[PDB]
Amino acid sequence: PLSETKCTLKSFTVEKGIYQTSNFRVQPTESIVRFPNITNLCPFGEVFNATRFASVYAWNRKRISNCVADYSVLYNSASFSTFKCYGVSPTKLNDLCFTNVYADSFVIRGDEVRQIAPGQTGKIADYNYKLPDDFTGCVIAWNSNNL
Amino acid sequence: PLSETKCTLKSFTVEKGIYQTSNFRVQPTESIVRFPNITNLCPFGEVFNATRFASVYAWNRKRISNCVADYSVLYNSASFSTFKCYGVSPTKLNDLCF
Amino acid sequence: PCSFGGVSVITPGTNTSNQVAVLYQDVNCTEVPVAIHADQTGSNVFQTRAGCLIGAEHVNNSYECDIPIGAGICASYQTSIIAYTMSLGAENSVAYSNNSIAIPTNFTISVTTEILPVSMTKTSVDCTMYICGDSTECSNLLLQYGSFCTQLNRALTGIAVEQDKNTQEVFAQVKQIYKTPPIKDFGGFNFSQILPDPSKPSKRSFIEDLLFNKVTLAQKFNGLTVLPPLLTDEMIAQYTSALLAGTITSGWTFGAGAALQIPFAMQMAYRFNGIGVTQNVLYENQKLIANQFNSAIGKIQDSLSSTASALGKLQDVVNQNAQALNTLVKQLSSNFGAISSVLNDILSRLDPPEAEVQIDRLITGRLQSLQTYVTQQLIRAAEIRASANLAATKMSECVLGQSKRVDFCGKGYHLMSFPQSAPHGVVFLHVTYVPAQEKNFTTAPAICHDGKAHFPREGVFVSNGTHWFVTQRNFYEPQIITTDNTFVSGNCDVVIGIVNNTVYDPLQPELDSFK
Amino acid sequence: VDCTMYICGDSTECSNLLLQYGSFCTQLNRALTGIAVEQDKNTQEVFAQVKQIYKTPPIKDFGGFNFSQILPDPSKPSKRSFIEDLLFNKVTKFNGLTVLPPLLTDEMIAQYTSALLAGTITSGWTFGAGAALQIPFAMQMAYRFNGIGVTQNVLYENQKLIANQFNSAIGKIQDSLSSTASALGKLQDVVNQNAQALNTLVKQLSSNFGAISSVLNDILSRLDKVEAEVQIDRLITGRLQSLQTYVTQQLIRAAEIRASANLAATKMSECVLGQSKRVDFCGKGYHLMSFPQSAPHGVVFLHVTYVPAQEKNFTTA
Amino acid sequence: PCSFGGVSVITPGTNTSNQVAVLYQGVNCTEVNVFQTRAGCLIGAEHVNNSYECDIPIGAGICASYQTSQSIIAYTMSLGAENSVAYSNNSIAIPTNFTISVTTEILPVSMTKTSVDCTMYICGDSTECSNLLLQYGSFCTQLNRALTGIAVEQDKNTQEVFAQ
Amino acid sequence: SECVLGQSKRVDFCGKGYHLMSFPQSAPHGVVFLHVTYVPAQEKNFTTAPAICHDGKAHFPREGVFVSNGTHWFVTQRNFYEPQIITTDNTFVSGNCDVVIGIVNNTVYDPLQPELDSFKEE
Numbered sequence A: 001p002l003s004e005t006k007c008t009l010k011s012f013t014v015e016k017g018i019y020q021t022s023n024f025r026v027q028p029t030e031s032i033v034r035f036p037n038i039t040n041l042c043p044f045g046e047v048f049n050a051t052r053f054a055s056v057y058a059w060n061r062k063r064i065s066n067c068v069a070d071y072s073v074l075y076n077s078a079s080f081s082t083f084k085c086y087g088v089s090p091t092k093l094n095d096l097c098f099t100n101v102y103a104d105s106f107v108i109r110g111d112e113v114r115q116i117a118p119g120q121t122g123k124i125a126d127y128n129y130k131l132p133d134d135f136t137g138c139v140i141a142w143n144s145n146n147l
Numbered sequence B: 001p002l003s004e005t006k007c008t009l010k011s012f013t014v015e016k017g018i019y020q021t022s023n024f025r026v027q028p029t030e031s032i033v034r035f036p037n038i039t040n041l042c043p044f045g046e047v048f049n050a051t052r053f054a055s056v057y058a059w060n061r062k063r064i065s066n067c068v069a070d071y072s073v074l075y076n077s078a079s080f081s082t083f084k085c086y087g088v089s090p091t092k093l094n095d096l097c098f
Numbered sequence C: 001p002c003s004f005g006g007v008s009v010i011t012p013g014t015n016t017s018n019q020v021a022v023l024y025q026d027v028n029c030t031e032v033p034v035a036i037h038a039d040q041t042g043s044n045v046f047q048t049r050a051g052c053l054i055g056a057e058h059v060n061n062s063y064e065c066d067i068p069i070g071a072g073i074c075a076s077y078q079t080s081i082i083a084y085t086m087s088l089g090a091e092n093s094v095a096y097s098n099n100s101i102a103i104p105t106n107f108t109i110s111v112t113t114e115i116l117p118v119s120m121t122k123t124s125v126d127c128t129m130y131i132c133g134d135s136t137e138c139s140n141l142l143l144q145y146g147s148f149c150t151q152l153n154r155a156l157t158g159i160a161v162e163q164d165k166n167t168q169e170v171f172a173q174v175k176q177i178y179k180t181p182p183i184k185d186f187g188g189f190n191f192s193q194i195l196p197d198p199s200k201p202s203k204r205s206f207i208e209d210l211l212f213n214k215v216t217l218a219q220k221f222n223g224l225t226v227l228p229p230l231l232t233d234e235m236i237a238q239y240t241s242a243l244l245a246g247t248i249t250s251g252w253t254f255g256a257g258a259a260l261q262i263p264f265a266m267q268m269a270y271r272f273n274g275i276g277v278t279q280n281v282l283y284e285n286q287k288l289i290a291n292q293f294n295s296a297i298g299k300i301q302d303s304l305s306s307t308a309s310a311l312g313k314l315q316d317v318v319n320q321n322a323q324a325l326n327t328l329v330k331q332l333s334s335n336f337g338a339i340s341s342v343l344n345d346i347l348s349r350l351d352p353p354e355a356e357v358q359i360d361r362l363i364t365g366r367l368q369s370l371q372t373y374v375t376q377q378l379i380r381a382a383e384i385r386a387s388a389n390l391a392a393t394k395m396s397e398c399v400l401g402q403s404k405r406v407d408f409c410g411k412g413y414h415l416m417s418f419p420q421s422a423p424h425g426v427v428f429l430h431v432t433y434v435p436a437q438e439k440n441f442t443t444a445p446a447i448c449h450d451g452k453a454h455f456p457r458e459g460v461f462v463s464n465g466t467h468w469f470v471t472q473r474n475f476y477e478p479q480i481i482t483t484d485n486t487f488v489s490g491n492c493d494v495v496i497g498i499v500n501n502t503v504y505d506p507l508q509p510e511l512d513s514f515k
Numbered sequence D: 001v002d003c004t005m006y007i008c009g010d011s012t013e014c015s016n017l018l019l020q021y022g023s024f025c026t027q028l029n030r031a032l033t034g035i036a037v038e039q040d041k042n043t044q045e046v047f048a049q050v051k052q053i054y055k056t057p058p059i060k061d062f063g064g065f066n067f068s069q070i071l072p073d074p075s076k077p078s079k080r081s082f083i084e085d086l087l088f089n090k091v092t093k094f095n096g097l098t099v100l101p102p103l104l105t106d107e108m109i110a111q112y113t114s115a116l117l118a119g120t121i122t123s124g125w126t127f128g129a130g131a132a133l134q135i136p137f138a139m140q141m142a143y144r145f146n147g148i149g150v151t152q153n154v155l156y157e158n159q160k161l162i163a164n165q166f167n168s169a170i171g172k173i174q175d176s177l178s179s180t181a182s183a184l185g186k187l188q189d190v191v192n193q194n195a196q197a198l199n200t201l202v203k204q205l206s207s208n209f210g211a212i213s214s215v216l217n218d219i220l221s222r223l224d225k226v227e228a229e230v231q232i233d234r235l236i237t238g239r240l241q242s243l244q245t246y247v248t249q250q251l252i253r254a255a256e257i258r259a260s261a262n263l264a265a266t267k268m269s270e271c272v273l274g275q276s277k278r279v280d281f282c283g284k285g286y287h288l289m290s291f292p293q294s295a296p297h298g299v300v301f302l303h304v305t306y307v308p309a310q311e312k313n314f315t316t317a
Numbered sequence E: 001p002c003s004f005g006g007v008s009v010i011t012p013g014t015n016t017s018n019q020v021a022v023l024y025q026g027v028n029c030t031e032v033n034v035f036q037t038r039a040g041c042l043i044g045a046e047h048v049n050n051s052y053e054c055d056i057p058i059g060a061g062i063c064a065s066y067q068t069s070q071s072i073i074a075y076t077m078s079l080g081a082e083n084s085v086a087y088s089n090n091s092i093a094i095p096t097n098f099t100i101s102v103t104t105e106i107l108p109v110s111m112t113k114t115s116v117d118c119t120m121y122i123c124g125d126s127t128e129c130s131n132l133l134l135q136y137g138s139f140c141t142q143l144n145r146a147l148t149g150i151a152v153e154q155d156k157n158t159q160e161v162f163a164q
Numbered sequence F: 001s002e003c004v005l006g007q008s009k010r011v012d013f014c015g016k017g018y019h020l021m022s023f024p025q026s027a028p029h030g031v032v033f034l035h036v037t038y039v040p041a042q043e044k045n046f047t048t049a050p051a052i053c054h055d056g057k058a059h060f061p062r063e064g065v066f067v068s069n070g071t072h073w074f075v076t077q078r079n080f081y082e083p084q085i086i087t088t089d090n091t092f093v094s095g096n097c098d099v100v101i102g103i104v105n106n107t108v109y110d111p112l113q114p115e116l117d118s119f120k121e122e
């Protein structure tokens, strides 16, 4: 303790008195992880690999719930030109736990994925499909040359 | 006004006394917009209703600068064949200008 | 600019009625009931200098002010809500002459509650776990901001020792503990309300159980500490119990040096000399002092019995501190444009190469909120101590001795005092000297006899039309114009306004005692 | 100060970002209102040291003393005194700024003074103690010369001498404040120290704080929601900070005013309501008595001392 | 949340000893010679049922000291010695002698007149920093203004005290 | 102002004890006052009285208090023991002695009676 005081005061001499030096905090002893568990897996392969897709004019909103996600296998695989997430980091999704998930499926030209970002203005963003400025989620895009 | 005091004093039995708690303003009503007495008038009658008309090889690159061309009278005349504006609406090219 | 301002509510209190009153501030009262932000408004409209108001009626009659509106306008309840120009009490130009002194005859001895805050609760705030809360990488971004909260502790520990220094300098201004005498026969003066009593928890007094229950209101959780005060609460009485003792028993002498024996029945004789009243008024009216002193000590619990309107400053000084503590707590749930308030939601679903940018403003606005708590404490802390140094000064001239500065300890001529314990303050019992029942007399500033002036040693000359007398400047007790009570200087006619009367010489019947 | 109007002009988008900065401006609203209670309470503690009102008797017989200079005249509409009229002429928006008026008008301030004036003329010191007790003013100095150890023949044998000197002393007071303006600088600073803070409070809106424009309506008119939110973010920190800077300047100065006031009312106590022994406390000299007069935001005491002169040397024993 | 508390060190000066004690504020001794106080858990000190006048304050009526081997001790502070004045209705005490004491009473009157240039403190000499400080407008004239007020005010204090 | 340029009647404002004077001393960034005080010490315990009945007339002291060491009575001032023979110029009269409480009996020496008695002896 005396060394803590000497370090706190920036001197090698400590006078008669009471000096506050530090804080004490009981540390954790282990980790306990808890989650809801569902016997169903979320059908994400069913949407990315669907043989016929939605146009941007009539874009598909499929909904996801009551399932155990596995994004890591979807992340860790390489089939995607870009994988960007906003308000959330793409590695971290496997940690969080959500109430709903919506998969918004459609196809688009390449120079217009410059424009798909949330709050970014442009033709496709304002007339066809919009993402709010407070959007949280992930956008995936992958090039289609034989699909 | 009884429970309006309760909206910020966080209780029910408010004590006898004044409580500066609320404000007001006056809403705007008409939103008038003013400009100079327009009177500027880009000459378009000498380039559209002209008499001497040219060809494509001898196009005189004639200058229009620092006036106002009322495109609104070039809209309701409605006698055009290829009235096509590339990258700008006809509504607000009177509002944003090059 | 088109008009806008604050708008408030006049209420007579919640349970009394529900008739309300709305005040608009410095707006001409035309566009008022229409535009926006009206909880609807009514019928009557009245204009003042402070704006116009709705929810009352102006009354040409005036009364004592209760609720301040502005510009000399106050409001109350009647069975309804009205508004009125303030009064200032009874407008009475009392009598005046050039040959009239009003001298009182009888007198009451009242008391007056006067309470000052002497301290505040020694709050103390941890730096790091307020900002982050036992989390590593948040704390590493703290230390790159240098040494903000290092001086904030030394600010708050600096004020922590300060009220400990205040409490030390406001009570223990005697050096030693005194022991109250076991026998209790002090000339009929019943001190039973203010003495410590053994049948309570071992040191307490009878005002205290009426006082400890009267002053009430968070607790120990995240982010805060409440260090207890230095001097423990039980012996706070014990200093005051000692402070009773000598100024009950030994008199005012122990403020100087070693104590001295004196009985309390004649201590007021010195104290009656403290405002220039002779020592005969004690013994000739000792029992009359007693019941009025009993009743003043009787009424002093009774004014404070149900709910006095004079607890006030000592009740809210916990309370405005407590919400100041509490408004620091609401800032934990603030958000500051970051997408959370708890840190763990950021560490849940964000990217640690970029999540610190959301933490970056999150550190600032929480620290920005902390600076507000720094100043809000510090300004009142100086305001308490400057009040408290006055409070110990009021302990000084008014408990240890009999001061002279009028209207400094109790409204009236200061006789003595009695300090009592309190939750965070001191409660004095100022015992004033209020005279009453005047009888205006025919008076004159000087007496000529034998061509030579005469002037009393202290006091005036009154007459009931015929016979002149001598009594002192603040109490009526007529005596005979003598030789000893006056002195001589100068011829008569140099001074205006003198009347004529013979002067009795006591030496002349002593000259006539032997012939 | 309205917090919303000074931070945001009229845009609710500015008002939305303020709302998620927590309960900041309500605290600044609280403490300024806390100042607003103290300013009325300081006025309450200084001049309402009397139970009731006393107006002067109509007779002006006082053994040669004049008080017309400090008594208010009934001839004026605002029933004030001429010295006050000298004191009432030597002292000279839309952004949350709001001048709430004081609690008492200066006519009402004049009511307390005239009340305190009259009983001090007519009732000794006694009215500050209990019930009022009348006295000739020729004798009240005979109280007070006993207060500094002067035998009261010296008053009475030289009453005509003292009165004219007391009269010509008042004429100097009328002279020194109707010609020179420097001695009123103490009040003049307080309004000026108030006024400089107001002007620098408003002019901070001319500052960008690293924005593309200091005015708010331009950024709302030329950018979208996302990129202007960063620009408005810079606008709040600095406007809010100047507001907090304004509050901190107000609070510390208020404590000085709070420290000023209790010194004043004690002098209303020790030097108006009675005769203090404390030397060097109300004027220079053995203190006799005083007179208070109304003043804008202030009070002016007129102390009367006993300064001796014209000595000889004396062998003592 | 599992327990925490501020930590402070009780110690005398180092020119007497290096022995110390520790105060774990607001947390008692079932979670960290031991002594339980209403301040917290106090370790490194020994309780004594005598009462010596305060030398180090702690809290809750406890004070510490370093007296004689030698150790830190804790105790409930005394308030001076228990005493009582003899009393009756026919007994008085009058001095027969006296003594002239001389008390010292020190007060401060002034402090060092410090003045700071904002532009200096923030920007070394750089024009870029100065330009970007200008665009904050006139904050830092206010700071210089306040310091100047202090500087004048400290001369006024000294003047009022000594030029009586 | 109140303790160098005069004498403070305010108890325990300038020094502990009854105040007499002070002396100032310069100090860096401050001032030092040296209060000089009168401190009573070395007392005795006397038995007192509030007043005296001589012939029916109650007597009270102009200053001081009546004291008794034993088989004798005196009057003396209040912060110093300096016992004086009681006389009518030390005291004063008001009323009868049936109204006072705690009173005692004693004869008061009168300084006029001896001169007058001396003349009757002549």
Ligand SMILES: *[C@@H]1O[C@H](CO)[C@@H](O)[C@H](O)[C@H]1NC(C)=O
Pocket: A044, A045, A046, A048, A049, A074
């Ligand atoms: C279909 O996606 C799933 C996972 O979403 C993956 O197992 C499969 O290989 C994908 N199909 C192709 C052709 O890559």
Ligand SMILES: *[C@@H]1O[C@H](CO)[C@@H](O)[C@H](O)[C@H]1NC(C)=O
Pocket: B037, B038
């Ligand atoms: C332009 O100014 C003239 C000057 O009187 C006025 O008569 C005319 O109406 C103005 N033009 C317009 C469009 O207002």
Ligand SMILES: *[C@@H]1O[C@H](CO)[C@@H](O)[C@H](O)[C@H]1NC(C)=O
Pocket: B044, B045, B048, B049, B077
């Ligand atoms: C051309 O002239 C006719 C009538 O002269 C008119 O109606 C028309 O608006 C004019 N158009 C242009 C472009 O000048």
Ligand SMILES: *[C@@H]1O[C@H](CO)[C@@H](O)[C@H](O)[C@H]1NC(C)=O
Pocket: C015, C016, C307
């Ligand atoms: C309102 O309540 C207070 C305390 O709860 C009480 O003193 C007061 O008399 C009540 N008012 C009425 C009108 O009953």
Ligand SMILES: *[C@@H]1O[C@H](CO)[C@@H](O)[C@H](O)[C@H]1NC(C)=O
Pocket: C028, C029
């Ligand atoms: C409000 O307006 C009316 C007439 O428009 C005017 O008579 C009155 O004086 C105004 N109020 C004030 C406070 O000036």
Ligand SMILES: *[C@@H]1O[C@H](CO)[C@@H](O)[C@H](O)[C@H]1NC(C)=O
Pocket: C059, C060
């Ligand atoms: C009261 O004041 C009102 C408003 O000026 C006036 O009309 C009325 O005559 C006054 N007197 C009475 C007795 O109502």
Ligand SMILES: *[C@@H]1O[C@H](CO)[C@@H](O)[C@H](O)[C@H]1NC(C)=O
Pocket: C190, C191, C192
């Ligand atoms: C003092 O008053 C209390 C009131 O309860 C009474 O019980 C007690 O006997 C009184 N004591 C004396 C000495 O009169």
Ligand SMILES: *[C@@H]1O[C@H](CO)[C@@H](O)[C@H](O)[C@H]1NC(C)=O
Pocket: C095, C439, C440
């Ligand atoms: C003073 O005495 C006169 C004598 O007539 C009387 O009229 C007057 O009312 C008295 N004033 C008082 C008692 O205030």
Ligand SMILES: *[C@@H]1O[C@H](CO)[C@@H](O)[C@H](O)[C@H]1NC(C)=O
Pocket: C464, C465, C466, C467
């Ligand atoms: C005045 O008081 C004296 C005192 O005894 C008394 O003799 C006399 O009758 C009283 N009245 C008048 C009118 O003198």
Ligand SMILES: *[C@@H]1O[C@H](CO)[C@@H](O)[C@H](O)[C@H]1NC(C)=O
Pocket: C098, C099, C496, C497, C498, D061
């Ligand atoms: C008092 O005033 C009256 C007239 O008002 C006058 O006759 C008398 O001489 C005055 N007496 C004194 C002592 O001033």
Ligand SMILES: *[C@@H]1O[C@H](CO)[C@@H](O)[C@H](O)[C@H]1NC(C)=O
Pocket: D312, D313
């Ligand atoms: C006589 O008085 C004057 C006035 O101060 C003084 O200067 C002088 O020294 C005195 N005479 C003596 C002998 O002290």
Ligand SMILES: *[C@@H]1O[C@H](CO)[C@@H](O)[C@H](O)[C@H]1NC(C)=O
Pocket: E015
């Ligand atoms: C203070 O320190 C030095 C070195 O330890 C020593 O010489 C001196 O005696 C010490 N003081 C005391 C009181 O021992």
Ligand SMILES: *[C@@H]1O[C@H](CO)[C@@H](O)[C@H](O)[C@H]1NC(C)=O
Pocket: E028, E029, E030
């Ligand atoms: C800690 O909590 C209380 C608080 O003083 C104390 O009495 C007790 O000994 C400790 N806890 C337990 C479980 O003993």
Ligand SMILES: *[C@@H]1O[C@H](CO)[C@@H](O)[C@H](O)[C@H]1NC(C)=O
Pocket: E048, E049, E050
């Ligand atoms: C401490 O007080 C306790 C009473 O429980 C006693 O055991 C002990 O002897 C006391 N200390 C001393 C020094 O007497």
Ligand SMILES: *[C@@H]1O[C@H](CO)[C@@H](O)[C@H](O)[C@H]1NC(C)=O
Pocket: E086, E093, F044, F045
């Ligand atoms: C004698 O005076 C001293 C003062 O300390 C005291 O001890 C003693 O009790 C006094 N006499 C009596 C009878 O108490």
Ligand SMILES: *[C@@H]1O[C@H](CO)[C@@H](O)[C@H](O)[C@H]1NC(C)=O
Pocket: C185, E089, E090, F101, F102, F103
């Ligand atoms: C003091 O009171 C007691 C009652 O016990 C009595 O015996 C004694 O004589 C009284 N003394 C005086 C001086 O009245």
